Design a protein around this nucleic acid. Structure first.
Lengths: 212, 75
RNA sequence: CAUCAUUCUAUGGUUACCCAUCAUUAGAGGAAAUUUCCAAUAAACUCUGGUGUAAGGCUUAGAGUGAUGGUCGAGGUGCCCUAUUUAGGGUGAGGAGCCUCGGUGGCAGCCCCACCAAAUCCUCU
RNA sequence: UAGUCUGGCACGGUGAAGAGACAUGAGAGGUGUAGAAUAAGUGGGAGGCCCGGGCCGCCGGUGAAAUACCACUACUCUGAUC
């Protein structure tokens, strides 16, 4: 699992010979794996932590009935009413559209319940897992999943793909999202042992480069 | 083997499927009717002279065994 | 009424996690045959809670609704014997497991009637 | 328990032909109703690419994923050998 080449931690600013594209790109990192079973109780599950502002952009939704009335308008919360999650799940089988059109949901406190009725566990097998915490702290607690950890999964195709950083932050911010990513593959280590065979550090869209 | 259950007299729709559509058949015989419309065969012998007294069908040759009628003329 | 789904309610259920089959773990189960019976053989197949993942509302009390105050229509699917093999000759029993408003023939479509089937196997003889 | 039958290790080699692997270095490969399409998949995605100009698409529509746009593991076999 352990490799490391953290003695020459420069030569990442090489921009204009890889980068010449104009849309908003996400630095999405593929790493090479070997010798793992998708069938059995063999797991490749967990959420690798990233405190150093990754900032994933997707179809974002946020709920919560707290002192987040004014705290959540800093980001401009699309706060649809707790009552108005009815057609969220209803225009799904009767109507042939994705009635969500948002790739996250939220669990909140001040009130221990978010919703345990047909609407809440109606999301329980939709994907886009509502897991995040915004219970009692209130520092911002709105972007503290986005600016906090990334999630990944395992499946039947034996391959891994997940984002590490984004294009708005520089190459000296794309270097802060390499060290604190694959050092959590030496800390997190069951005896599915020696999982990392080759490492592919990358832009979003360019050429393959090696740190091992 | 396969026992069949017939009916004594008409249903309202079955007379509208008799009086319209049996004059669209050619063999109007009491053995045709009780196989097709599935009634007690004795009935179909009596219904056809009421249609002659109504004036739809043509008595070709009546007999004890088989009475033979046909649908409406051309002229 | 016994029911699956529809909309208005749901202090109701858990997000690295819940359904219904299939895949498997520990249980509950025979008529014909056979002949005059009896207790037994020996399971096919059905479900109870365990657990898993390609489709998806779990369930739950209950107000208004698709549809029988009886419901689905209900006729087909096998095994064995033959140089009538596009066919002819047999008829034990009991579980399971599926298509269609089927296309062509007749007094032509609907009723009557003919045939070609959607996937059929396990078992005590 | 002597003996004897037998398998392993050892002394213990050389060269070729061969059969299978692994390490490998390229191709080809995918058919549920369906949506215009033999849906191999993951992090995607409404944009980029070439000649201001133009392209495949979005959505509708099939269906937890839907086509252009960086990559790479697997899986059905072929397949070059320091």
């Amino acid at each position: 699992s352990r490799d490391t080449l953290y003695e020459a931690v420069r030569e990442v600013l090489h921009g204009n010979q890889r980068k010449r594209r104009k849309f908003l790109e996400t630095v999405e990192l593929q790493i090479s794996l070997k010798n793992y079973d998708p069938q059995k109780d063999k797991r490749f599950s967990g959420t690798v932590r990233l405190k150093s502002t990754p900032r994933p952009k997707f179809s974002v939704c946020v709920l919560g009935d707290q002192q987040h009335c004014d705290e959540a308008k800093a980001v401009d919360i699309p706060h649809m009413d707790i009552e108005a999650l009815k057609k969220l799940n209803k225009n799904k089988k009767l109507v042939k559209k994705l009635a969500k059109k948002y790739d996250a949901f939220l669990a909140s406190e001040s009130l221990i319940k978010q919703i345990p009725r047909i609407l809440g566990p109606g999301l329980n097998k939709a994907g886009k897992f509502p897991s995040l915490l915004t219970h009692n702290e209130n520092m911002v607690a709105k972007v503290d999943e986005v600016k906090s950890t990334i999630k990944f999964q395992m499946k039947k195709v034996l391959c891994l793909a997940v984002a590490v950083g984004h294009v708005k932050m520089t190459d000296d911010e794309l270097v802060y999202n390499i060290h604190l990513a694959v050092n959590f593959l030496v800390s997190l280590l069951k005896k599915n042992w020696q999982n990392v065979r080759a490492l592919y550090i990358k832009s979003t869209m360019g050429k393959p480069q090696r740190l091992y | 083997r396969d026992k069949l259950n017939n009916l004594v007299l008409f249903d309202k729709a079955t007379y509208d499927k008799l009086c319209k559509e049996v004059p669209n058949y050619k063999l109007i015989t009491p053995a045709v009717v009780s196989e097709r419309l599935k009634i007690r065969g004795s009935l179909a012998r009596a219904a056809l002279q009421e249609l002659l007294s109504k004036g739809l069908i043509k008595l070709v040759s009546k007999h004890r065994a088989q009475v033979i009628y046909t649908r409406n003329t051309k002229g």
